[PDB]
Amino acid sequence: SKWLDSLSDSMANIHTFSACLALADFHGDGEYKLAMGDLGPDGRQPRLKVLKGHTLVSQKPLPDLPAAAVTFLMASHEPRTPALAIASGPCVYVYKNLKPYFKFSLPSLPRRQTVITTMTTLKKNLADEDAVSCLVLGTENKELLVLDPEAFTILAKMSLPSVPAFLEASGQFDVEFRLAAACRNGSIYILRRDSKRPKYCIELGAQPVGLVGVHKVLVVGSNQDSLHGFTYKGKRLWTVQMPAAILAMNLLEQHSRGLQAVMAALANEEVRIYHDKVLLNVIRTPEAVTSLCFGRYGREDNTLIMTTLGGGLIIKILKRTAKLNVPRKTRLYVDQTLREREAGTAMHRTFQADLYLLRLRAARAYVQALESSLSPVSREPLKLHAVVQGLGPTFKLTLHLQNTSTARPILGLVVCFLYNEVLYALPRAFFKVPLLVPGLNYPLETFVKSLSDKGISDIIKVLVLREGQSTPLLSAHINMPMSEGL
Amino acid sequence: SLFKARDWWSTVLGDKEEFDQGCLCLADVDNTGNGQDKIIVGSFMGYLRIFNPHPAQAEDLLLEVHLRDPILQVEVGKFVSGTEMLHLAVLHSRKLCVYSVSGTLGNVEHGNQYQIKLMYEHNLQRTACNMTYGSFGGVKGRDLICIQSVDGMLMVFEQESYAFGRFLPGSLLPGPLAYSSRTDSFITVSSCHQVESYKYQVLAFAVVDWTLNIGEQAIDICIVSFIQSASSVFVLGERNFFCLKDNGQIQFMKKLDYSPSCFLPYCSVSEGTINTLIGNHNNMLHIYQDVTLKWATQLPHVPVAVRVGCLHDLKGVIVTLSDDGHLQCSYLGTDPSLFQAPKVESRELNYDELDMELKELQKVIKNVNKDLKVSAMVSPNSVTVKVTLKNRVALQKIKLSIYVQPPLVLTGDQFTFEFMAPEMTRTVGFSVYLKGSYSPPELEGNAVVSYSRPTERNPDGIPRVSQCKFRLPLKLVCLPGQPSKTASHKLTIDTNKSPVSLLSLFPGFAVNVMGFRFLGGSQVTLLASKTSQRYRIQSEQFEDLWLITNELIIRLQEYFEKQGIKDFTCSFSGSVPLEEYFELIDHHFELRINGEKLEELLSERAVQFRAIQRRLLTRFKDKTPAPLQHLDTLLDGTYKQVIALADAVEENQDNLFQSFTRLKSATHLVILLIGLWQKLSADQIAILEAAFLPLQQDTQELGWEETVDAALSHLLKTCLSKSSKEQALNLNSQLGIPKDTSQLKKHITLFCDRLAKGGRLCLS
Amino acid sequence: EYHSVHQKLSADMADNSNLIRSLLVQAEDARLMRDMKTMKNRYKELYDLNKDLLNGYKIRCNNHTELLGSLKAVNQAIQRAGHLRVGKPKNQVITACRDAIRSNNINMLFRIMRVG
């Protein structure tokens, strides 16, 4: 136990991802609210929900589904109340005071409809929170747009070898910016300054479910349920496996401690990782969590908001006080190995005699079964078994008949039923059999009806045989169950 | 020999005799004073037999007297006033007789005689059932006896003198009676499962000292007094074993999982406990210290009485007696014989006979790898058909059954001949007629017979089946009508002969431009072309063309063979329809999809009805009232919807069946046209008839489209197609309900066109 | 007699509930093989059994409310007897009447309610 559950809600509908789940005081007076641009249950009603404390207060309707909702700063000199930039199709909506304020659109370059799929911000000069942050975006049309921190001029267009899926950024704009775009094609690309081609690709082997940028090393979560720590250069450093499917991840932080690890949501209702030296990020949950956001909520600096699978809402406050089984052989074994050591020849001779008699009796019974055609498996490669379904005075007798051969059909076949014409009423006893395609099971149904006014069962034989010939190719037997009828 | 009652002196005791408990007794009736015991056995016939086994032989039987009336009970005790010598008391239904077995010796061991001298007799005014004996009160040197009448009455006789008789209170059947001396009490197990103990003085003065409701009624009751440390009343119930204290409550009890017959607590070995001995109706004895099973051994017979006595210098011999007559002394077998096959040398394996038989059977095995005529006659006139079936051997379990078609109906369907002696003839007669509206897909009919050939391996005989086909007359389901002129659907069959007069082929349909109306309403037109050699068949429905087109062709062949001409064809230039065919396939598949949708709707309605019914059930289980009219008015609506959906599924099943029967005729005609259009041989026609005409009706797991599509895919894949990408992508065989008939139609058209391009059909 | 009637009604309703569960299973079976005549017959029998069981429920609940009225009458009578006496006689009379009714010794009940 290392977390104080502030609110673990179970039956409110909140379906957002950690990219469209941002926290800020979009109004001022130093008290933090939580904006979440979610699509609702499915792609019907996307509504920006604002959370203040424990309960919802406002849901602004959106035109389409928000691919992201990022909070940045917009005043380097004397920062004002920051606004929220949400994305929807080609539109980016800037919301000052959490009110609909401004709308910008992507330059339509040959209508042809574009879409924005991820947003992320990057600092300007001093690498602190009091400075301004330049935007980064990725499009379905293979472009990546680095824009002025206020989104009124295109500053850096970039080409991507594939459609992006996740973005992250580090460094300072003028000095150097590192743009890690994890694409859908099963790779990442680190774009740097003055790139006519991104020039930096890294393979992982599959599509990544997220990414996290620690100070020096970068982290990527694989769709195959693992975490892989790379360096920005392009060399894999370390790998670790997760006991469940990674749903989503984010960038945990605690400036009073210096611990900066990864919050990996798992499908086993858990967050789990092994850091360099200490064993942290170990937290359970009733239902699988799908989005995470660690930040300063309300007034405290170490809140953790989570949105689970079936809606719900979780809030956890982090406390500042952070040989072999070889069997045993009893006396029976030694006494019997003794009697075999003394008198092994008698045992050997009598076993050989009994085995000769056994081969004789088995050949006898097998010849009898061949004679009476009683085998349901025996050129002319066929197989037949029968199933009775039902407990009433009527049973579905389904014959599974299969031609078991490399490639040749079986044209001329018929099925006859031999039954007691007093106890059972079969409508079609004799019927032909379709062209048995080799390798396919043909279920042929029939409806038996128990006619006995009491409970009286009896056998029913099924002969599969060619039309021309008169000797059953094979036979099956069915012990018809008790009537249980009237 | 471990866990078996090893035998001793034993003998069967009569010729269909009858013994019970109280027959077997075991004491020193001869008063030898030594200490051995003599086996006394009465019978339900009269044979009082006293033995002294000396291990059978003939010196054993001391005597075998025969008294007139049956012997219910036998006992040994001081039943005479003055002397303190053991006497023998014998109880018959209405008589008590105390004898004195006195034996006088002879100079040779087979010259000594024994006589039973009647020491006294009491007449019983009631029919006894059993009796007990003891020192009633505290009198010494006496064993006076209480006899229980079968109508619940204890008649107490102090020896030689009828003392009194008291009616037991509240008893219908008689139960086991015992006498306790530590408490001076009679103890019975009445019919109301009540073990009741009465005090002797209260009986003599006349009530019940104590009672105990054991759960059943008791076979035997033994108040054992070899030990005086603590008296205990043992009771053998018909399902449970009890040992009860002297105050009345259960000292302990065991729940036997078998049906006991007799029990006997003999002497104890440990401190306080009492070894006891109980015999099953599984003929097995159990030795139980308290309730713990100390031993168990298999008796030869189901004992009716067991005793344990000292017989000829051996203590603790078990003496069992059945009701058949098996009397047996025995001891317990304690030899854990080894489990090893016997090391015999005489008995060896007769390898020659066995090997001849094995070579015979192996010959049949390696060979397996490498007689009733049926004939059907259709009268020329609801036409009456007669099937004649004849044999050449003595066949058995013969069954004949006829299958015509869905629309056509028979008046008799099954005929059972249990046995028909060799080279004999049977003849059945049935009659077939149309019942319905649509016309059947073929006027054929099949008569299948199944019999059993009695052989040497199996006396019930191999099952065999043989079948015959008959062809019903067209004039069963048709009549002449007015020939139309311009119908919607038409097909033209061209022949290489002279156009024949239609009044010749169809003489009961009269006119060289003929018209047919079928029972049901369908109408077909047959036009003989006067300038060409062809004929034309037309009708507004593509299905109704098949029956007339078939009969045109068949009767053309028959006429030209009757005349004597041999050269004859039915070329049918043109194109196979493939467009009025697909409409029937689409109709059939639409009906199938409707049926599946209705089945899902009915599934949902049934689940909902079940949930509401379970709610109502839980409501019914609760004792307290609760308003529920909402629930039952939901149930009524759900149930009426269930009824509606059931009727709708029935309607769809019937519609689908009619669609299937029309599609059968359509595909018949299409195969006919494809065979005329590419000059298909008989085998290449049979392959088509097997691929395109699979089954009789649609079922909820197999239907028409799946089967025909799998078969056509296999034929295209292994006979016509060459490329492998097509063989793997387009040509795929699966047997589940499709999503649309697109693939079936694609494959039928591809099959037609690749037949047109020279391809021919094979199997492998 | 209220006790006995409720016992008999509960027995009968248990019988009919077992019948209804059997018919539910049988109807599901007949519906799984698309045998609609037998399925419709099971559903008819279920309808009829539900009607009969609803009649049985009505009569059982009526008798049960009457039984509750009778039990409250008995308990309130014991309390009215006890409430008539002040102090230690109160619980004495109460327990005496309870023991005289657990043993169905009605005459002793009225004797202890009169003077005792």
JSON list of C-alpha atoms in Angstrom, two decimals, chain A residues 16-122:
[
{"chain": "A", "resi": 16, "resn": "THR", "atom": "CA", "xyz": [-10.42, 8.82, -23.27]},
{"chain": "A", "resi": 17, "resn": "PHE", "atom": "CA", "xyz": [-6.76, 8.03, -23.93]},
{"chain": "A", "resi": 18, "resn": "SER", "atom": "CA", "xyz": [-3.67, 9.38, -22.20]},
{"chain": "A", "resi": 19, "resn": "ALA", "atom": "CA", "xyz": [-3.00, 11.64, -25.20]},
{"chain": "A", "resi": 20, "resn": "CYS", "atom": "CA", "xyz": [-6.40, 13.39, -25.00]},
{"chain": "A", "resi": 21, "resn": "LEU", "atom": "CA", "xyz": [-6.28, 13.69, -21.18]},
{"chain": "A", "resi": 22, "resn": "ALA", "atom": "CA", "xyz": [-4.55, 16.90, -20.10]},
{"chain": "A", "resi": 23, "resn": "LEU", "atom": "CA", "xyz": [-4.59, 18.86, -16.86]},
{"chain": "A", "resi": 24, "resn": "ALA", "atom": "CA", "xyz": [-4.28, 22.61, -16.34]},
{"chain": "A", "resi": 25, "resn": "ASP", "atom": "CA", "xyz": [-5.87, 25.68, -14.78]},
{"chain": "A", "resi": 26, "resn": "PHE", "atom": "CA", "xyz": [-7.48, 26.81, -18.01]},
{"chain": "A", "resi": 27, "resn": "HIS", "atom": "CA", "xyz": [-9.23, 29.59, -16.02]},
{"chain": "A", "resi": 28, "resn": "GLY", "atom": "CA", "xyz": [-6.61, 30.94, -13.58]},
{"chain": "A", "resi": 29, "resn": "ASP", "atom": "CA", "xyz": [-6.51, 31.52, -9.80]},
{"chain": "A", "resi": 30, "resn": "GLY", "atom": "CA", "xyz": [-4.02, 28.68, -9.26]},
{"chain": "A", "resi": 31, "resn": "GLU", "atom": "CA", "xyz": [-6.32, 25.66, -8.97]},
{"chain": "A", "resi": 32, "resn": "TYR", "atom": "CA", "xyz": [-5.90, 22.82, -11.43]},
{"chain": "A", "resi": 33, "resn": "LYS", "atom": "CA", "xyz": [-8.76, 21.28, -13.42]},
{"chain": "A", "resi": 34, "resn": "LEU", "atom": "CA", "xyz": [-8.67, 18.16, -15.60]},
{"chain": "A", "resi": 35, "resn": "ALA", "atom": "CA", "xyz": [-9.71, 18.40, -19.25]},
{"chain": "A", "resi": 36, "resn": "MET", "atom": "CA", "xyz": [-10.45, 15.16, -21.09]},
{"chain": "A", "resi": 37, "resn": "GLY", "atom": "CA", "xyz": [-11.46, 15.17, -24.73]},
{"chain": "A", "resi": 38, "resn": "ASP", "atom": "CA", "xyz": [-13.23, 11.84, -25.11]},
{"chain": "A", "resi": 39, "resn": "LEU", "atom": "CA", "xyz": [-15.35, 10.26, -27.82]},
{"chain": "A", "resi": 40, "resn": "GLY", "atom": "CA", "xyz": [-17.92, 8.96, -25.34]},
{"chain": "A", "resi": 41, "resn": "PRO", "atom": "CA", "xyz": [-19.02, 5.32, -25.61]},
{"chain": "A", "resi": 42, "resn": "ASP", "atom": "CA", "xyz": [-18.05, 5.06, -29.27]},
{"chain": "A", "resi": 43, "resn": "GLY", "atom": "CA", "xyz": [-17.64, 7.53, -32.11]},
{"chain": "A", "resi": 44, "resn": "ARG", "atom": "CA", "xyz": [-21.06, 9.11, -31.53]},
{"chain": "A", "resi": 45, "resn": "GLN", "atom": "CA", "xyz": [-20.79, 11.93, -28.96]},
{"chain": "A", "resi": 46, "resn": "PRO", "atom": "CA", "xyz": [-17.28, 13.35, -28.43]},
{"chain": "A", "resi": 47, "resn": "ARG", "atom": "CA", "xyz": [-17.58, 15.79, -25.51]},
{"chain": "A", "resi": 48, "resn": "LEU", "atom": "CA", "xyz": [-14.76, 17.62, -23.74]},
{"chain": "A", "resi": 49, "resn": "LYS", "atom": "CA", "xyz": [-15.36, 16.86, -20.06]},
{"chain": "A", "resi": 50, "resn": "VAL", "atom": "CA", "xyz": [-13.89, 19.07, -17.35]},
{"chain": "A", "resi": 51, "resn": "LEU", "atom": "CA", "xyz": [-13.37, 17.57, -13.89]},
{"chain": "A", "resi": 52, "resn": "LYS", "atom": "CA", "xyz": [-12.91, 19.64, -10.72]},
{"chain": "A", "resi": 53, "resn": "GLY", "atom": "CA", "xyz": [-12.28, 17.56, -7.62]},
{"chain": "A", "resi": 54, "resn": "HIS", "atom": "CA", "xyz": [-14.69, 14.61, -7.51]},
{"chain": "A", "resi": 55, "resn": "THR", "atom": "CA", "xyz": [-17.56, 15.28, -9.93]},
{"chain": "A", "resi": 56, "resn": "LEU", "atom": "CA", "xyz": [-18.12, 16.47, -13.48]},
{"chain": "A", "resi": 57, "resn": "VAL", "atom": "CA", "xyz": [-19.23, 20.05, -14.07]},
{"chain": "A", "resi": 58, "resn": "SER", "atom": "CA", "xyz": [-19.25, 20.59, -17.86]},
{"chain": "A", "resi": 59, "resn": "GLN", "atom": "CA", "xyz": [-19.14, 18.66, -21.15]},
{"chain": "A", "resi": 60, "resn": "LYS", "atom": "CA", "xyz": [-18.65, 20.77, -24.28]},
{"chain": "A", "resi": 61, "resn": "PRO", "atom": "CA", "xyz": [-19.86, 18.99, -27.44]},
{"chain": "A", "resi": 62, "resn": "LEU", "atom": "CA", "xyz": [-17.30, 18.45, -30.18]},
{"chain": "A", "resi": 63, "resn": "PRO", "atom": "CA", "xyz": [-17.86, 18.15, -33.96]},
{"chain": "A", "resi": 64, "resn": "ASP", "atom": "CA", "xyz": [-15.80, 14.98, -34.40]},
{"chain": "A", "resi": 65, "resn": "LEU", "atom": "CA", "xyz": [-13.62, 12.67, -32.32]},
{"chain": "A", "resi": 66, "resn": "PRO", "atom": "CA", "xyz": [-10.66, 14.33, -30.56]},
{"chain": "A", "resi": 67, "resn": "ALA", "atom": "CA", "xyz": [-7.40, 12.66, -31.58]},
{"chain": "A", "resi": 68, "resn": "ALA", "atom": "CA", "xyz": [-5.65, 14.64, -28.82]},
{"chain": "A", "resi": 69, "resn": "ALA", "atom": "CA", "xyz": [-6.07, 17.49, -26.36]},
{"chain": "A", "resi": 70, "resn": "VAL", "atom": "CA", "xyz": [-2.79, 19.11, -25.31]},
{"chain": "A", "resi": 71, "resn": "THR", "atom": "CA", "xyz": [-2.18, 21.95, -22.85]},
{"chain": "A", "resi": 72, "resn": "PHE", "atom": "CA", "xyz": [0.76, 24.30, -23.45]},
{"chain": "A", "resi": 73, "resn": "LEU", "atom": "CA", "xyz": [1.73, 27.84, -22.46]},
{"chain": "A", "resi": 74, "resn": "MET", "atom": "CA", "xyz": [1.13, 30.99, -24.52]},
{"chain": "A", "resi": 75, "resn": "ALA", "atom": "CA", "xyz": [2.93, 33.88, -22.77]},
{"chain": "A", "resi": 76, "resn": "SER", "atom": "CA", "xyz": [6.66, 33.79, -22.08]},
{"chain": "A", "resi": 77, "resn": "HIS", "atom": "CA", "xyz": [6.57, 37.26, -20.51]},
{"chain": "A", "resi": 78, "resn": "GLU", "atom": "CA", "xyz": [4.12, 37.05, -17.58]},
{"chain": "A", "resi": 79, "resn": "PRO", "atom": "CA", "xyz": [2.35, 33.76, -18.44]},
{"chain": "A", "resi": 80, "resn": "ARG", "atom": "CA", "xyz": [-1.43, 34.13, -18.65]},
{"chain": "A", "resi": 81, "resn": "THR", "atom": "CA", "xyz": [-4.12, 31.48, -18.16]},
{"chain": "A", "resi": 82, "resn": "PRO", "atom": "CA", "xyz": [-3.09, 28.67, -20.56]},
{"chain": "A", "resi": 83, "resn": "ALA", "atom": "CA", "xyz": [-5.50, 27.40, -23.20]},
{"chain": "A", "resi": 84, "resn": "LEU", "atom": "CA", "xyz": [-6.24, 23.89, -24.44]},
{"chain": "A", "resi": 85, "resn": "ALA", "atom": "CA", "xyz": [-5.59, 22.82, -28.04]},
{"chain": "A", "resi": 86, "resn": "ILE", "atom": "CA", "xyz": [-7.78, 19.90, -29.10]},
{"chain": "A", "resi": 87, "resn": "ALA", "atom": "CA", "xyz": [-7.67, 18.23, -32.51]},
{"chain": "A", "resi": 88, "resn": "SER", "atom": "CA", "xyz": [-10.49, 16.94, -34.71]},
{"chain": "A", "resi": 89, "resn": "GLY", "atom": "CA", "xyz": [-9.91, 16.08, -38.35]},
{"chain": "A", "resi": 90, "resn": "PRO", "atom": "CA", "xyz": [-8.20, 18.97, -40.14]},
{"chain": "A", "resi": 91, "resn": "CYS", "atom": "CA", "xyz": [-9.39, 21.32, -37.38]},
{"chain": "A", "resi": 92, "resn": "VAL", "atom": "CA", "xyz": [-7.45, 22.38, -34.30]},
{"chain": "A", "resi": 93, "resn": "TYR", "atom": "CA", "xyz": [-9.53, 24.14, -31.64]},
{"chain": "A", "resi": 94, "resn": "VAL", "atom": "CA", "xyz": [-7.86, 26.51, -29.18]},
{"chain": "A", "resi": 95, "resn": "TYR", "atom": "CA", "xyz": [-9.99, 26.85, -26.04]},
{"chain": "A", "resi": 96, "resn": "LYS", "atom": "CA", "xyz": [-9.15, 29.78, -23.78]},
{"chain": "A", "resi": 97, "resn": "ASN", "atom": "CA", "xyz": [-10.94, 29.68, -20.41]},
{"chain": "A", "resi": 98, "resn": "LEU", "atom": "CA", "xyz": [-12.28, 26.27, -21.53]},
{"chain": "A", "resi": 99, "resn": "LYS", "atom": "CA", "xyz": [-14.56, 28.27, -23.85]},
{"chain": "A", "resi": 100, "resn": "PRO", "atom": "CA", "xyz": [-14.66, 27.90, -27.65]},
{"chain": "A", "resi": 101, "resn": "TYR", "atom": "CA", "xyz": [-12.12, 30.54, -28.66]},
{"chain": "A", "resi": 102, "resn": "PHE", "atom": "CA", "xyz": [-10.32, 29.90, -31.96]},
{"chain": "A", "resi": 103, "resn": "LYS", "atom": "CA", "xyz": [-10.15, 27.42, -34.83]},
{"chain": "A", "resi": 104, "resn": "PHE", "atom": "CA", "xyz": [-7.33, 26.72, -37.29]},
{"chain": "A", "resi": 105, "resn": "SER", "atom": "CA", "xyz": [-7.23, 24.31, -40.23]},
{"chain": "A", "resi": 106, "resn": "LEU", "atom": "CA", "xyz": [-4.55, 22.42, -42.11]},
{"chain": "A", "resi": 107, "resn": "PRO", "atom": "CA", "xyz": [-3.40, 23.76, -45.50]},
{"chain": "A", "resi": 108, "resn": "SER", "atom": "CA", "xyz": [-5.30, 21.75, -48.11]},
{"chain": "A", "resi": 109, "resn": "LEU", "atom": "CA", "xyz": [-2.62, 20.66, -50.59]},
{"chain": "A", "resi": 110, "resn": "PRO", "atom": "CA", "xyz": [-3.88, 18.53, -53.55]},
{"chain": "A", "resi": 111, "resn": "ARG", "atom": "CA", "xyz": [-11.96, 17.78, -51.88]},
{"chain": "A", "resi": 112, "resn": "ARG", "atom": "CA", "xyz": [-9.06, 15.96, -50.20]},
{"chain": "A", "resi": 113, "resn": "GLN", "atom": "CA", "xyz": [-9.69, 15.61, -46.47]},
{"chain": "A", "resi": 114, "resn": "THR", "atom": "CA", "xyz": [-6.74, 15.41, -44.07]},
{"chain": "A", "resi": 115, "resn": "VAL", "atom": "CA", "xyz": [-6.64, 14.40, -40.39]},
{"chain": "A", "resi": 116, "resn": "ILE", "atom": "CA", "xyz": [-4.40, 15.16, -37.40]},
{"chain": "A", "resi": 117, "resn": "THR", "atom": "CA", "xyz": [-3.56, 12.08, -35.34]},
{"chain": "A", "resi": 118, "resn": "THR", "atom": "CA", "xyz": [-1.20, 13.21, -32.54]},
{"chain": "A", "resi": 119, "resn": "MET", "atom": "CA", "xyz": [-0.05, 16.43, -30.85]},
{"chain": "A", "resi": 120, "resn": "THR", "atom": "CA", "xyz": [2.88, 17.24, -28.54]},
{"chain": "A", "resi": 121, "resn": "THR", "atom": "CA", "xyz": [4.64, 20.42, -27.44]},
{"chain": "A", "resi": 122, "resn": "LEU", "atom": "CA", "xyz": [8.29, 21.42, -27.13]}
]
